[PDB]
Write a protein that binds this ligand. Sequence first.
Ligand SMILES: CC(=O)N[C@H]1[C@H]([C@H](O)[C@H](O)CO)O[C@@](O[C@H](CO)[C@@H](O)[C@@H]2O[C@](O)(C(=O)O)C[C@H](O)[C@H]2NC(C)=O)(C(=O)O)C[C@@H]1O
Ligand code: NA
Ligand code: NA
Ligand code: NA
Lengths: 666, 666, 644
Amino acid sequence: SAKGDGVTDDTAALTSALNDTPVGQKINGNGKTYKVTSLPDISRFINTRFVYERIPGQPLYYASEEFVQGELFKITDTPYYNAWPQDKAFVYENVIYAPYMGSDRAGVSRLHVSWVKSGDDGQTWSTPEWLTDLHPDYPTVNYHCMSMGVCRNRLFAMIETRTLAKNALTNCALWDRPMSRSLHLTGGITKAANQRYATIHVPDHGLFVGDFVNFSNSAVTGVSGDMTVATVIDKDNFTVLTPNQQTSDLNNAGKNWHMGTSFHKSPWRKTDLGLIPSVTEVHSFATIDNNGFAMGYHQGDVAPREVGLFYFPDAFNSPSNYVRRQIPSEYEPDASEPCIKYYDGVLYLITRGTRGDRLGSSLHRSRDIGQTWESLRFPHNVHHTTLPFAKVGDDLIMFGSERAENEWEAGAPDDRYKASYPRTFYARLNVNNWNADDIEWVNITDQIYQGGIVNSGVGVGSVVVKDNYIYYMFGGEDHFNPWTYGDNSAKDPFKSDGHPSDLYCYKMKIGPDNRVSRDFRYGAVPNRAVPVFFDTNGVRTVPAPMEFTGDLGLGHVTIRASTSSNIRSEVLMEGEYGFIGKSIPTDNPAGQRIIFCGGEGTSSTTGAQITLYGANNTDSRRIVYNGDEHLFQSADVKPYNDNVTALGGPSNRFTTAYLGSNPIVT
Amino acid sequence: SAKGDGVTDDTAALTSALNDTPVGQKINGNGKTYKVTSLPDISRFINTRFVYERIPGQPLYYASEEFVQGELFKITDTPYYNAWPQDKAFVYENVIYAPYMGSDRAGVSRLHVSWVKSGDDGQTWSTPEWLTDLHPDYPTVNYHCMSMGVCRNRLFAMIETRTLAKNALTNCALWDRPMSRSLHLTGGITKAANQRYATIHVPDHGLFVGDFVNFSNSAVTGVSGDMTVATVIDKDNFTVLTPNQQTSDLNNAGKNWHMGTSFHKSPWRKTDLGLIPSVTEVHSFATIDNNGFAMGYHQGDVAPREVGLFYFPDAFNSPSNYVRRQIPSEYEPDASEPCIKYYDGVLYLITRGTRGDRLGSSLHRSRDIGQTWESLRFPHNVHHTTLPFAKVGDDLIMFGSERAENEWEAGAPDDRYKASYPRTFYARLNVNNWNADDIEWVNITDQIYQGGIVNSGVGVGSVVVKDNYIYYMFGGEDHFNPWTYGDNSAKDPFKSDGHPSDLYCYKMKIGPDNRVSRDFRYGAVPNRAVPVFFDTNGVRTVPAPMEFTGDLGLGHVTIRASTSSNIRSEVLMEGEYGFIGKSIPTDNPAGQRIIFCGGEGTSSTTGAQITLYGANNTDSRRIVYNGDEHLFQSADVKPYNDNVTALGGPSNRFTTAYLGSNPIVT
Amino acid sequence: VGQKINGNGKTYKVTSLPDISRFINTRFVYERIPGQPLYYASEEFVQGELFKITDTPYYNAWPQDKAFVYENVIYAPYMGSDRAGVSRLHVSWVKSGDDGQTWSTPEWLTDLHPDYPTVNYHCMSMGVCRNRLFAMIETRTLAKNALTNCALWDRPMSRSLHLTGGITKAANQRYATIHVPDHGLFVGDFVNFSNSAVTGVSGDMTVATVIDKDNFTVLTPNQQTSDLNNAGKNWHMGTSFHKSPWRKTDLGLIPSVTEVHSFATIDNNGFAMGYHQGDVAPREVGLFYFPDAFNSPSNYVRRQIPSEYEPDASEPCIKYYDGVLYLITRGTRGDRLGSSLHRSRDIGQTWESLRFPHNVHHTTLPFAKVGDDLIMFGSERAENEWEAGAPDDRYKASYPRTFYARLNVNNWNADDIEWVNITDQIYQGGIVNSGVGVGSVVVKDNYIYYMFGGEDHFNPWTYGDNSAKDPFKSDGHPSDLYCYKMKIGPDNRVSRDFRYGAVPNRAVPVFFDTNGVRTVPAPMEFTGDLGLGHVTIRASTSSNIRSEVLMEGEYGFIGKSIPTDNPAGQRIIFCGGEGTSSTTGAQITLYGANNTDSRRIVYNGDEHLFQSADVKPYNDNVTALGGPSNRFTTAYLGSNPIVT
Ligand SMILES: CC(=O)N[C@H]1[C@H]([C@H](O)[C@H](O)CO)O[C@@](O[C@H](CO)[C@@H](O)[C@@H]2O[C@](O)(C(=O)O)C[C@H](O)[C@H]2NC(C)=O)(C(=O)O)C[C@@H]1O
Ligand code: NA
Ligand code: NA
Ligand code: NA
């Protein structure tokens, strides 16, 4: 009989337990931890944790179902290489944002900084949105982002420019943009008599001149509908220009009204920071207060290695000013990509370890935004994974993932070029006790590493808390080879199964849920990406505007009435010029031509026709113009060249010519 | 330890229990009800119900998981404002129908009366089908429907016309259509010698003249394939006109054959009822017998208020004949939108309460289809929700949803303009006991109210029973703002996340299931809406006909051979006229032009060309016609105006003119 | 509604089926038909789960018996048609790269036959032998489903190989020898090379010659003065299913064959394929063994099961484990002896046999061997058809039962076999045929997978408005694929299970662009009739200088429909500019016959320049230049008019 104390070997007791248990009946471990010399059939346990040393001296923990209140979700399913949520996730006004990079490789080729969002606490996720376009100088360089967050109602992001060839950092820019909001306000709008401007009082609006603002029911004439910020007075007040003026002062004190902001309608503010000295990557984001934030960084190109943060004390007035702070030099070797968060006046920082044979991930806290630090190192050379985290009560809750199976432990070699099932872990650390000696890494889910290339999209995620749940957004692969070694060295995502990397989210309960469940089974046709409705005629209909940028082959085509009170069908051609041409036919090239007709059929009885004959046609490059009237308006009918071509011929005579004078013969 | 008697305060015992048990342990309540002064961590309980007074003196009940044997499903996911299944759901020949309205707001703007269907007892749902088009007089008026059902194999619906400006009723029409069926029959067709009609015996066929009927293996010559109903003899007999005749009488007695009906291929029968006096909304549907049905209604625009039903005793012969029957006068104030159902000679009616500070939902039963009533009032002013229901055994099983969190209780004010989690309830009422004093509203699922606008799409649903399961189809939102106050006051569904309201279905066990589970996890690529197949050369191929009505941007386009034994590629343009034009270039505006070519390339060596130059071109509005022959057929070559334009010019001379006679001057 | 009950993994005898969903971890034994006990599992009694794996408008059925696992990927091949027949049929598959949790967009493996619609393809036998897919591709008539031709099609499977050495290149010549053990490649097959360390052996190449089973040569575009050898150096290859052609071996109309069905890999050289003959008497059931499919794909030997087991039998499933070939038949009729099981240690020359009790019929019994047990799956095609003597029950909707059973091969006795009903499907009932069942079985790791058909309640309207059986009208055809995933050994890892919460974005990959508009970057083919609204053709071609539309066929046609409201306005305006106003650009307007100005053409530009040819009337001495009310001002000529 098992003791469940986390020290006594219960392997034998649990083996007998399973043998006495009906085939496919579950053993309840009662929330206890059981020491084992081998992991048993974990699927036949509930409410059970195992402690096991795969490598002697390195105990790790393994959760059966129901031991933690949690669940894994798959959140993207796209042919791009979708990975690196690190470390960009945030929650804004009830919506969970999972930003990432969708590329074709571990590099910036075909890369768009992207996000998916959840509007239902993680149950379902949105169609991916591209946040960046391809760099103007693609394919020499392209964008990259591992640091993104919100400060005073604006999205802030460190948008890097990196080379395709080498992934070398060339530029850093701070990009920011107001977040979309709906506000229900009382008073705060004033408009002086006999002039057109109105002043809008909105505390911490976070808007700049030119940003979008929408007004409804303002009760101040002219302050209405889609508008823009004309001036900024201070952080709580701005003005707008109205189209009109009144002979009396206007004020809406005590009246309820609506505003009115937009991410989509407002431009990015882009602040070029140039080539920042001694930076390899900017990574992670911690909002400090109403004026600024910190971003993590490391330098791992030359000795000595740097790990720390950039603090932007006033990102609104001074986006180009930041303060570089480093962690103690003892912890900087063999470290990268710090995760940073700020709670109750304390800045916490956790490093990634570069290798399993050297001291790895370490934790740091600061009460002066990185000037001084208290530090500790995690045992057993934690490496290859970032450790995104949040603080809940006295605990830091951190998540990490090995990139391929059995790489987590100190001294464990990289195991690539073969399919495996990498373990994802979480751990708690009490901040009062400040001691990681006995930290317990709990394996809560396993991912797939594909093995077709050396690189892994598994892990390197990001963590957020919303209400009583914590969310770890991270990469995982599947068994579909990208055929980089094979027929797709070009890494085209749209061939075969594209790239196996996609995003996942582990949702874990971290406090009481005092409501009845919101959970549902998704049984709908997904109808947001390409919204389809069977029309009254039984034909699939897409009412959304769409862009098809890949090569298209179409069958029979009808252009419906669409434009100018639906009077006309319309096709517009872009570029410097448009070209409508005719392929060389397969079976009868001698028939190559296009018939243009003002009527419904190929018979010229249905309307006027012009037929352009191809060079392959029996009648090479012929043109036949066939109407019951040929009317040449606004210009002379001329030959292109001088004294080269004729009007008519001996076998094609015009009956006569109707003229206002004799011909001019020279 | 807790008593679980619904009367003893069990708060302290449950808190102690929760403290003493591991978080992954599901505390089993053994189906009992526990009185609490605050709701505990519900997620940690199984088979437990709580009774709690959020508002003193108003106890409500709260289900942990596995207390009711039910599950929530999401059943639509489209950008439209998808709400108001009220009260239209029905089951027909093994298929569950969930009709609704997909609009852009609480109103008729952009509205299509729609449905989704389930062919697997609610596990998965189909691509939305539009049942109505936009009204001929859109955007002044559009359709609206809250009453729909089936009577003798025909769909019947009250199709309303309402103004976009005010949502005011302008017209009521009864629309009906035969439902699609396949019948596998033996005998029943006769055809008299020397004439062409055949008589088809199908009891209660429900077809009218002109309705679609398909025949297979009839063994009666000429009764074959797609046909239509020629005459209707009576409710059990109709004729078809065949294309042929025989010399002896035909009768397929004893022979197996197939029919034959189609919703899609049959027209609506539309009966104009004008503007029915004293009606605000027609809502809910109760099939009475083989001949007719009732539809609920209320009048709430002027005083005094009316609530009742319209009975259509013989909708087949007399669709214009309806009988107005009100509920008792004292239950009409502050009431609307009655749900009606008919079971074993009893008509049941349940009202919606208009406000929480006045007597609300009431229940009524009648043994004479609404001529006389027995009535009861639900305690505590039930308001803002319809209460759709079914009868199973001795119990009415009713479902309701508050529109926003904490609105259910009597005296509870509306709580809008902030995100919340509205409670959905069900309750049983024993019809023998006929007393609602002790009714128990059980919170079984929570929805989301978004809060970006005052209106809520939550709830207002519909209920059906299929086999041993009850289904509540209803609205729910998510956290995605429609940006009505923001960049989308126009409420375009296809911008951003469109509208958050979508449909859900709660599926609850109400009787024994004598089969092994049909349950599956859905792991397929949804491939009905836009059916895609990777063809043998690895390109995504869509074989379905489609309509793309939204603005379309295309890249490189190839129009394949498609028409007249695939001899030609074809584009047809609709409207009064077609327009093919050229945008102003943004790189080189002075190059603006389109090249039309009878060959494969831009070089005129490949085929005859006509190039139309834009006004922005350096050669403003030039036309170059370039072929090896220019042949003008069927008409004179003329200038558009008289004595204004010339043939040739001083630097563009024709060599000569070949004429049958001298020029005619002037 | 009864409170839920834990049955503690026990089996209970009952005279009526109980409220099954009331129970957890319980099995019931019940004799629906007296003397024929069957077993019924409540939730959680079996460690297993059902998945829906296709959802397309085609009639998706007949995984039988083609499923296989290759290098971590589970393949579920099937036929997507419009009926029980070869009309509109493509041999297709879906795949899982996550141990059955999620499945891929359907891929068509075959096109329509060159002689469609007289004949089309059909396949019930597919598998892998030495890194090549092998399939028996049948040609059958649309009219009668009659077999006209059998062909063996084979193709190398896509692989990525991470190797060390094996590439040698002799000096002064270009051919390089590549050493890949059991490569299974032929001349012309695709090979990709990376980091070879041998000059010229690089990128996309093809096999030039095959020396033996372990060595082949490639032709490089260069040569070196010294010998080359990458022994001790790491490099990459390099194979492709899609970029290599099929090898097609015509076997003609194989005599006495109705269907080829099922696939058993024997060794590194060959395999067996099951068959039956059931159109003429006497019936045949057995296998075809291809001992050397690589050198001699046309060489096969016919092996029948014992004669007493051939009547009333079809569609054998065959598998090969540890020197023994196992075969299980499908029964034709419930009133005659049905499914039987056979084993052979000499590839079907001699057999040991047994009969399953109670006339098992209408189902194939695909299976695998796990330890001492055969684990087999079957499905009745409609509800209550399974039992001996049970009549077919079609033309009404029902819930057919799916079963599995174990059979210990040491005991070799099926008398006490326990068929366990693990899941129920839907049979729609709109037509007599059923897509339910007829599946395929694979094992991957500690899980067994049964891939099979099931329908839903949506009528195809064959009897109704869709006798043409067009999949793209209404809900198309109800048959789609499912997969039951059952645990068959310990799982010593933490769970990989997830809830799928993503937008499915493989079939039609959509991304909201930076302008907020849905964007599809994948190349696509739309073959169904398209109706389009406002269309903009974007710059795409020749360093994006131009927008481009190319028209195929013998000729292209751009025309104008007869207008509904104003037919007197029928025309198309072609414009070099942005708007309908001629101020924006040169215009040519072609008027329809319905227009007030019937078949008028107006050419409107600030220059009309006729290049490369005379301006001529089509006919001789019939039409004029100008008219009495449309005079040209003059004619500028190099010489006086030539007048008749
Ligand atoms: C949609 C459509 O048909 N647009 C055509 C318009 C259309 O008739 C509008 O109602 C405006 O007229 O007309 C265009 O053509 C004019 C002749 O109708 C245009 O050619 C002008 O016609 C003269 O008015 C005239 O005397 O009738 C005057 C100008 O010399 C002449 N201008 C030019 C540039 O030719 C139009 O663009 O307005 C053509 C268009 O397809
Ligand atoms: Na991917
Ligand atoms: Na919606
Ligand atoms: Na199907």
